[PDB]
């Protein structure tokens, strides 16, 4: 998008549209996130769902 | 994989270091916890002057060096000599560069706050590891036996401990330490075996008394009518062949050595013994948690490997515990590495990633960060 | 259905909250009336820092938190901590959003005018419920036993009450409050059981004395020649097995604990007891209504569940009442939830719709509106 407004010369500022999703992703893939908690407990010989 | 492969687990002991990669089933590296310093100037053929020696080269060359033990009773007493054992572990034993490997270390039961901060200072500031973590030893042993509440009798080379753990938190005020372990036990066998009319005269005689203790020693149940049995002289006796022919016989003393763990009085110790101490730890804990601890006496450590240790302990605490109670003494086969294996599991785990102390945490929070 | 399904019934107690949907036969949610505040900084594995804990998580984690009871003797004493228990009830326990559910609440017998206005202020202004209503507890208990005139002996965890009700109006000047209930009763058993030669030492020993009180305690009729019976030692004794094996025996004390409700002197209380108090309430009422109250002694509350409570009360007041009178002690089986069930009935009722205080009434009349 930003290339056009640059090519044309329009003056439009905007934040990455991805950013909106980073919240969800971090929660899953980050260290104290779901997977981790999931993969840690897997190390506990006597853990439960 | 980045660190799935890459996590290191180093268990620092009073007698042995156990080390390797999180993921493996057993330690890649096991070696004495010594640092030898040469008493004289000179060289081995083909080598240069060496200022220091560590592990087995210090043991093998002990006649020309002054040997020193960095960890007295599980606590690091000399930090110059410990950084030497770590250096050896990373660079020579595991041959890894530490600055790209997360490192899980272990500490002892009531390890002073200041030490956990100091080994963190040395891990991050002189070895530059990406991230590290210090687990308490009994806690890794328990966890390696699947569970989270139980009481570990942990016994290695310089210390014995009882660490009651509840849903993962080791209970500070109920932990007991008994300074008599496998080291003390080899020296007592030594005397009851010279006292059997023998001589462990050269250093090749000294060292192997320890290999006698490991191979032939027993913990008899009803140690009472086992001495009585000794006397009728059954085929209870056991002869070991020395470095040479010199067939030495050990019948009886074979079990008089681990009876030291129940009777410290055999060695001029006035402290209570292993089973009473298991128990006392337990009547120092909350009331509602005592049925749990009793059904989960997990054993770990080289000195708890004597066969029939578990049966003697089984009957030792049944007969001290209220009969309404269920006793249960878990002693797994890999127990000389429980601690390490518990670390391997935990550190290779999917959920542990979010507890690693990173250089980001450290450079920003000071050693306090990992200290918890 | 809009609100047929939708009416909530929350009974706030000194020990327990009972909650659920008008329509149900019993509370969907029952849990301690505590709010725990952590004594130290730290976390559980996988959770964040929690400022506060409520209900069972506060009980389970009591060793690291300072526990507080918002309702002292049936009256709300801390409004910051009560709004916390309500929040927990709606959002976590019943998992409903409150702003679309009418809420029937309960208050105590001579609940200060200002409180009934304050919980209305918090219901409408911080929870934004559509409509609400505050019923008096004894009054819901009576009504749940079908009737409209009777006298309720109500006894739970922190208070006992006698609330004479006539054609629905609880009689202010005849109500009696006795501050000795199930809480007091568990602590007295505790001592007569340690006094039997025992120890409730850890917290897993403490908690279960209360489960002994509930399961094995009795109210004997002729408590006189029941002690006498104890002595000849019949098969009156009763052994309970603890969290572990430790089989504890309780023969006699089993009934010495509810004899405290008739004799407060067992616990250094100088107040009169349950039966005399039933009676005194009654000779404080109008003369013409006393035959009604006597044939309708409805019992409700956790502490009135001790078997043989009704027979002892039956004979306790027959023998104080003029012989021309009919005595009748109604004690239903669901009585530990009478209060709640009376609210469930009433609030699901076809005619109650026109007594709900709506936000229209409130935004227009101030808290005064519901206060009556």
DSSP state letters, B326-337: PP-EE--TTGGG
Nearest to C250 by CA among C263, C260, C240: C240
Give, rounded to a whole angstrom, the gap between the first and last alpha carbons of chain C: 27
B-facing residues of C in 50-109 (CB < 8 A) are: 63
In B, minimum Cα distance to C201 occurs at: B287
Instruction: Give the best residue of C44, C46, C47 to mutate against chain A (max A CB count within 10 A).
Output: C46
Q: Answer yes or no: do C203 and C155 share one domain.
A: no
Q: Answer yes or no: do C194 and C322 share one domain.
A: no
Query: Which two tokens mark C162?
Result: 């006698």
Most distant CA pair in chain A: distance in Å? 63
| Cross-sheet strand order for the sheet of C35-38 | C53-54, C35-38, C65-68
Yes or no: say if B295 and B328 are a contact pair by the CB < 8 Å rule: yes
Give, rounded to a whole angstrom, the gap between the first and last alpha carbons of chain B: 27
Q: Which residues of A touch C46 (CB under 8 A)?
A: 32, 37
- C-alpha distances in angstroms, A44 versus B10, B347, B352, C177? 19, 11, 11, 53
Among B146, B348, B353, beta carbon nearest to A45: B146
Segment (H or E) for B154: strand B150-155
Q: What residues pair up with B155 in beta bridges, in sequence order?
A: B160
Q: A36 and B352 in contact by Cβ < 8 A? A: yes
Q: Which residues of B touch C47 (CB under 8 A)?
A: none
Residue B25: burial class (beta carbons within 10 Å; 0-12, 13-18, 19+):
exposed
Write the Ramachandran bin of C61: left for phi over 0, alpha for psi from -120 to 50, otherwise beta: alpha
Which of B211, B240, B267 lies at the terminal end of a domain, its last residue? Answer: B267
Question: What residues have CB less than 8 Å from A34, skipping those under 6 apart?
Answer: A27, A28
- The helix/strand/coil state of B255 is helix
Q: Answer yes or no: do B320 and B341 share one domain.
A: no
Helices (H), chain B: 56-60, 79-88, 113-122, 137-144, 182-194, 203-216, 224-232, 253-256, 259-262, 274-282, 290-294, 309-318, 338-348, 359-365, 368-371
Yes or no: say if C216 and C256 are a contact pair by the CB < 8 Å rule: no
The contact set of B with A (CB < 8 A) is: 143-148, 345-346, 348-356
Q: Does any CB of chain C come closer than 8 Å to the CB of residue B288? A: yes
DSSP state of B354: G
Using CA atoms, how far apart are residues C152 and C110, in angstroms rounded to an integer?
A: 14
Q: Which residues of C touch A40 (CB under 8 A)?
A: 45
Instruction: Give the best residue of B353, B357, B361 to mutate against chain A (max A CB count within 10 A).
Output: B353
Burial C265-278 (b: 16+ CB within 10 A, else e): ebeeeeeebbbbbb
- The helix/strand/coil state of B48 is coil
Among A30, A42, A45, beta carbon nearest to B350: A42
β-strand pairing of B150-155 with B297-300: parallel
> Neighbours of B (≥3 Cβ pairs closer than 8 A)?
A, C
Nearest to B229 by CA among B266, B263, B255: B255
Q: B350 and A35 in contact by Cβ < 8 A? A: yes
DSSP state of B47: P
Query: Other C-beta atoms within 10 Å of B69: how many?
Result: 18
Using CA atoms, how far apart are residues B119 and B78, in angstroms rounded to an integer?
A: 11
Q: Answer yes or no: do C155 and C128 share one domain.
A: no
- The helix/strand/coil state of B40 is coil
Q: Which residues of B touch C239 (CB under 8 A)?
A: none
Among B286, B322, B372, beta carbon nearest to C246: B322
Q: Does any CB of chain B come closer than 8 Å to the CB of residue C48? A: no
Q: Does any CB of chain C come closer than 8 Å to the CB of residue B286? A: yes
* Residue found under tokens 């009696």: C176
Q: Answer yes or no: do C172 and C283 share one domain.
A: yes
Instruction: Give the best residue of B350, B358, B361 to mutate against chain A (max A CB count within 10 A).
Output: B350
> Neighbours of A (≥3 Cβ pairs closer than 8 A)?
B, C
Question: What residues have CB less than 8 Å from C162, skipping those under 6 apart?
Answer: C151, C152, C153, C154, C174, C175, C176, C277, C278, C281
Among C46, C203, C247, beta carbon nearest to B286: C203
In B, minimum Cα distance to A39 occurs at: B350
Q: Does any CB of chain B come closer than 8 Å to the CB of residue C203? A: yes
Q: Which residues of C touch A32 (CB under 8 A)?
A: 46
CATH number where C213 lies: 3.90.640.10
Domain limits for position B317: 136-181+271-332
Which of C267, C283, C307 lies at the terminal end of a domain, its last residue? Answer: C267
Q: Answer yes or no: do C30 and C41 share one domain.
A: no
Instruction: Measure in Å the smallest separation between the Cα of B80 and chain A Cα atoms.
Output: 34
Q: B325 and C203 in contact by Cβ < 8 A? A: no
- C-alpha distances in angstroms, B343 versus B15, B103, B135, B339, C221? 19, 10, 8, 6, 63
Using CA atoms, how far apart are residues B343 and B135, in angstroms rounded to an integer?
A: 8
Query: Which two tokens mark B335?
Result: 């127990």
Among B145, B146, B350, beta carbon nearest to A40: B350
Q: Which residues of C touch A39 (CB under 8 A)?
A: none
Q: Which residues of B touch C242 (CB under 8 A)?
A: 291, 324
Instruction: Give the best residue of B172, B173, B288 to mutate against chain C (max C CB count within 10 A).
Output: B288
Q: Answer yes or no: do C215 and C251 share one domain.
A: yes
In B, minimum Cα distance to C241 occurs at: B324
Which of B267, B288, B307 lies at the terminal end of a domain, its last residue? Answer: B267
Using CA atoms, how far apart are residues C222 and C237, in angstroms rounded to an integer?
A: 17
Q: B324 and C242 in contact by Cβ < 8 A? A: yes
Instruction: Measure in Å the smallest separation between the Cα of C334 and chain B Cα atoms.
Output: 30
Nearest to B291 by CA among B164, B124, B131: B164
In B, minimum Cα distance to C204 occurs at: B288
Yes or no: say if C90 and C96 are a contact pair by the CB < 8 Å rule: yes
Q: Which residues of C touch B291 (CB under 8 A)?
A: 204, 242-245
CATH number where C27 lies: 3.30.420.40
Q: Answer yes or no: do B18 and B103 share one domain.
A: yes
Q: Answer yes or no: do B236 and B284 share one domain.
A: no
Q: A39 and B145 in contact by Cβ < 8 A? A: no
Q: Does any CB of chain B come closer than 8 Å to the CB of residue C40? A: no
Q: What is the three-state SS of chain C?
A: CCCCCCCEEEEECCCEEEEEEECECCCCEEEECCEEEECCCCCCCCCCCCCCEECHHHHHCHHHEEEECCEECCEECCHHHHHHHHHHHHHHHCCCCHHHCCEEEEECCCCCHHHHHHHHHHHHHHHCCCEEEEEEHHHHHHHHCCCCCEEEEEECCCCEEEEEEECCEECHHHCEEECCCHHHHHHHHHHHHHCCCCCCCCHHHHHHHHHHHHHHCCCCCCCHHHHHHHHHCCCCCEEEECCCCCEEEECCHHHHCCHHHHCHHHHCCCCCCHHHHHHHHHCCCCCCCHHHHHCCEEEECHHHHCCCHHHHHHHHHHCCCCCCCCCCEECCCCHHHHHHHHHHHHHHCCCCHHHCEEHHHHHHHCCHHHHC
Q: What residues pair up with B175 in beta bridges, in sequence order?
A: none
In B, minimum Cα distance to C208 occurs at: B288
Q: C207 and B288 in contact by Cβ < 8 A? A: yes
Segment (H or E) for B135: strand B131-136
Instruction: Measure in Å the smallest separation between the Cα of B154 and chain A Cα atoms.
Output: 19
C-beta contacts of C346-350 below 8 A and 24+ residues apart: C346/C22, C346/C104, C346/C135, C346/C140, C346/C143, C347/C7, C347/C9, C347/C22, C347/C102, C347/C104, C347/C133, C348/C4, C348/C7, C348/C22, C348/C23
Q: Which residues of A touch C45 (CB under 8 A)?
A: 40
Residue B67 dihedral angles phi and psi, to the nearest 5°: -80, 140
Query: Which two tokens mark B350?
Result: 């999917």
Instruction: Measure in Å the smallest separation between the Cα of C45 and chain A Cα atoms.
Output: 9
Q: Answer yes or no: do C43 and C176 share one domain.
A: no
Using CA atoms, how far apart are residues C76 and C172, in angstroms rounded to an integer?
A: 19
- Domains in chain B: how many in total? 4
Using CA atoms, how far apart are residues C30 and C53, in angstroms rounded to an integer?
A: 16
Residue B90: burial class (beta carbons within 10 Å; 0-12, 13-18, 19+):
buried
Using CA atoms, how far apart are residues B21 and B8, in angstroms rounded to an integer?
A: 5
Among B168, B286, B324, beta carbon nearest to C244: B324
Q: Answer yes or no: do C201 and C276 share one domain.
A: no
Q: Does any CB of chain B come closer than 8 Å to the CB of residue C245? A: yes
Instruction: Measure in Å the smallest separation between the Cα of C276 and chain A Cα atoms.
Output: 54
In A, minimum Cα distance to B139 occurs at: A44
Q: What share of chain A is helix, strand, coil (3-state, %, to 5)?
A: 50, 0, 50
Q: Answer yes or no: do B47 and B113 share one domain.
A: no
- C-alpha distances in angstroms, C4 versus B268, C288, C343? 80, 39, 13
In A, minimum Cα distance to C47 occurs at: A32
Using CA atoms, how far apart are residues C363 and C369, in angstroms rounded to an integer?
A: 10
Query: Which two tokens mark B19?
Result: 């080390």
Q: B288 and C202 in contact by Cβ < 8 A? A: yes
Using CA atoms, how far apart are residues B148 and A47, in angstroms rounded to an integer?
A: 8
CA C177 and chain centroid, separation: 13
> Neighbours of C (≥3 Cβ pairs closer than 8 A)?
A, B
Q: Does any CB of chain C come closer than 8 Å to the CB of residue B294? A: yes
List the determination method. cryo-EM
Query: Which two tokens mark B129?
Result: 């590891």
Q: C204 and B290 in contact by Cβ < 8 A? A: yes
Burial C200-209 (b: 16+ CB within 10 A, else e): bebebbbbbb
């Amino acid at each position: 998008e930003q290339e056009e407004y640059k090519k044309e010369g329009i003056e439009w500022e905007f934040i990455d549209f991805g950013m909106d999703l980073a919240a969800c992703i971090e929660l899953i893939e980050k260290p104290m996130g779901i997977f981790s908690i999931l993969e840690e407990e897997c190390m506990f010989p006597k853990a439960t769902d | 994989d980045e660190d799935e492969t890459t996590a290191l687990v180093c268990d620092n002991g009073s007698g042995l270091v156990k080390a390797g990669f999180a993921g493996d089933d057993a330690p890649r590296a096991v070696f004495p916890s010594i640092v030898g310093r040469p008493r004289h100037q000179g060289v081995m053929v083909g080598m240069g002057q060496k200022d220091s020696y560590v592990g087995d080269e210090a043991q093998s060359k002990r006649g020309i060096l002054t040997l020193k033990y960095p960890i007295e009773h599980g606590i690091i007493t000399n930090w110059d000599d410990m950084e030497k054992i770590w250096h050896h572990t990373f660079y020579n034993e595991l041959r890894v560069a530490p600055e790209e490997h997360p490192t899980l270390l272990t500490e002892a039961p009531l390890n002073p706050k200041a030490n956990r901060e100091k080994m963190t200072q040395i891990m991050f500031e002189t070895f530059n590891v990406p991230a590290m973590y210090v687990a308490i030893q009994a806690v890794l042993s328990l966890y390696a036996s699947g569970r989270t509440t139980g009481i570990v009798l942990d016994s290695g080379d310089g210390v014995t401990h009882n660490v009651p753990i509840y849903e993962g938190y080791a209970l500070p005020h109920a932990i007991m330490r008994l300074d008599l372990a496998g080291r003390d036990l080899t020296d007592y066998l030594m005397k009851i075996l010279t006292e059997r009319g023998y001589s462990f005269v050269t250093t090749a005689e000294r060292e192997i008394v320890r290999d006698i203790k490991e191979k032939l020693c027993y913990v008899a149940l009803d140690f009472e009518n086992e001495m009585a049995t000794a006397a009728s002289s059954s085929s209870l006796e056991k002869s070991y062949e020395l470095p040479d022919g010199q067939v030495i016989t050990i019948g009886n003393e074979r079990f008089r050595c681990p009876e030291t763990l129940f009777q410290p009085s055999f060695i001029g110790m006035e402290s209570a013994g292993i089973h009473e101490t298991t128990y006392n730890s337990i009547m120092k804990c909350d009331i509602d948690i005592r049925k749990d601890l009793y059904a989960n006496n997990v054993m770990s450590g080289g000195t708890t490997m004597y066969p029939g240790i578990a049966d003697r302990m089984q009957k030792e605490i049944t007969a001290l515990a209220p009969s309404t109670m269920k006793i249960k003494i878990i002693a797994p086969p890999e127990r000389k590495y429980s601690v390490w294996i518990g670390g391997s599991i935990l550190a290779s785990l999917s959920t542990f990633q979010q507890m690693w102390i990173t250089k980001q945490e450290y450079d920003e929070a000071g050693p306090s960060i990992v200290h918890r």
